[PDB]
């Protein structure tokens, strides 16, 4: 009929259901709306987490009914970056990261300046504007900084 | 026992692929705590899952309790427990993705070990509701740059007209977040004690632990003693050794910094750049997901 998804962002969703629609069902229609992956949306109604295998109509939930949506945190990855000495910094990353903002990371992290490092992986220079994900990076894996 | 073998390199719970949700709850809920300790010692019943026995037999003598004597443990074990997790909820990366603590404590909890919700409340004089911790959802412009747990408590109980049916004896709030990229507050400030008096249709509880990610790894920080400076910080991959067939080392470093920013107002922590906060006590204040909170047995009075 017509729901109301709360976001802690302040936006506030407006969407067309039947009572007996699956939580599941809806999570794909907020997905189509702000492209958010059902996977990260959590369904929340009266301070209760609403699971995917019930229905709209066992929780109570009829037309101007207002739920709330927050965003689990999943995904991405930490990796180590290791200096000459042996120094050992580790970096909250994903994938998707280019260099550029691993870079940063760095400095957020250490203060380095991204400009003046120098990173390596299997051997090869890492180019700032290519991803993580691009140089087979994976969970666990070690790049090597140096300093010039 | 004692402390000292709780602190050091190559301490707490060995990191492995991904793993930092789990090996940070573990920690917060069981390196000191004893709240939950019955859920590892309570008999296998006729309702009980088929994976019962074994999963709290490998919680309870694989895991704690080499971590409660030694101070560390074996990312094998972890992962025999995220196996029996992947055959409970298969296809949902419990062998190889970073998840939510909130889903590993929904399966551990609910599925797996049959335990007895922590949380009743009720919402308006209806019927009450069962979880094992809460979330605090509330609009922000109103409210303070830089609030204490209690205020949120507060202010998501308002918002949503709910109370305590009954007093719980282990208190876990998810801070208020939308993903990676969205914190409603840049620094929180997690109040060591909580009083729920107001909170109850009809009266303390005391932080043991704070469960912090600030992107994507989880790390944790946990109240072992009523003193101000009793505090630890855990990392499951706080170093590696080796390369792609190495493996990580995890720490847990003191940190009683903390005790001495959580005894400075709110509004001195505001004005106060967060890269002028010493030590590990930035994450605590800027990462923080998970309060957890226990019936007072640490303190006095």
């Excluded at chain 1, 949506?69 to 994903?94: A, D, H, N, P, S």
């Excluded at chain 2, 390196?31 to 999963?55: A, G, I, N, Q």
């Excluded at chain 2, 599925?111 to 094992?132: E, F, N």
């Excluded at chain 2, 208190?171 to 990229?181: A, N, S, T, V, Y």
Aim: with cysteine; charged share 25%; glycine share 6%.
């Amino acid at each position: 009929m017509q729901i109301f998804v709360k976001t802690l962002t302040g936006k506030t969703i407006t969407l067309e259901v039947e009572p007996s629609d699956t939580i599941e069902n809806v999570k794909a229609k907020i997905q189509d709306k702000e492209g958010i992956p059902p996977d990260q949306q959590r369904l929340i109604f009266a301070g209760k987490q609403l699971e995917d295998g019930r229905t709209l109509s066992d929780y109570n939930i009829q037309k101007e009914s207002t739920l709330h949506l927050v965003l689990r945190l999943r995904g991405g990855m930490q990796i180590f970056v290791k200096t000459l000495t042996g120094k050992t910094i580790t970096l909250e990353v994903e994938p998707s990261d280019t260099i550029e903002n691993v870079k940063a990371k760095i400095q957020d992290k250490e203060g380095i300046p991204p400009d003046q490092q120098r990173l390596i992986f299997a051997g090869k220079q890492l180019e700032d504007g290519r991803t993580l994900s691009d140089y087979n990076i994976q969970k666990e894996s070690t790049l090597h900084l140096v300093l010039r | 026992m004692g402390l000292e073998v709780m602190v050091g390199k190559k301490k707490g719970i060995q990191g492995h692929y991904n793993s930092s949700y789990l090996d940070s709850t573990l920690f917060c809920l069981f390196s000191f705590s004893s709240v939950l300790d019955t859920v590892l010692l309570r008999p296998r019943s006729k309702t009980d899952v088929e994976y019962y026995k074994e999963t709290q037999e490998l919680l309870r003598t694989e895991i704690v309790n080499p971590l409660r004597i030694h101070g560390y443990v074996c990312a094998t074990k972890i992962m025999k427990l995220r196996r029996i997790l992947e055959k409970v909820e298969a296809a949902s990366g419990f062998t190889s993705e970073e998840k939510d603590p909130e889903e590993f404590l929904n399966i551990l909890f609910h599925h797996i070990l049959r335990v007895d919700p922590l949380l009743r409340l009720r919402s308006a004089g209806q019927k009450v509701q069962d979880c094992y911790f809460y979330q605090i959802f509330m609009d922000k412009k109103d409210k303070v740059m830089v609030p204490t747990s209690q205020q949120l408590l507060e202010w998501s109980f308002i918002n949503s007209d709910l109370k305590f049916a009954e007093a719980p004896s282990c208190l876990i709030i998810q801070m208020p977040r939308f993903g990676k990229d969205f914190k409603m507050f840049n620094k929180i400030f997690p109040s060591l004690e909580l009083d729920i008096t107001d909170l109850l249709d009809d009266q303390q509880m005391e932080l043991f632990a704070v469960l912090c990610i600030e992107t994507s790894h989880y790390v944790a920080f946990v109240k072992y003693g009523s003193a101000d400076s009793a505090w630890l910080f855990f990392d499951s991959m706080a170093d590696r050794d080796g390369g792609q067939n190495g493996f990580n080392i995890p720490q847990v470093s003191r940190c009683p910094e903390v005790g001495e920013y959580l005894k400075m107002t709110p509004e001195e922590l505001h004005a106060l750049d967060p890269k002028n906060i010493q030590g590990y006590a930035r994450r605590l204040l800027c990462d923080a997901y998970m309060c957890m909170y226990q019936s007072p047995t640490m303190s006095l009075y």
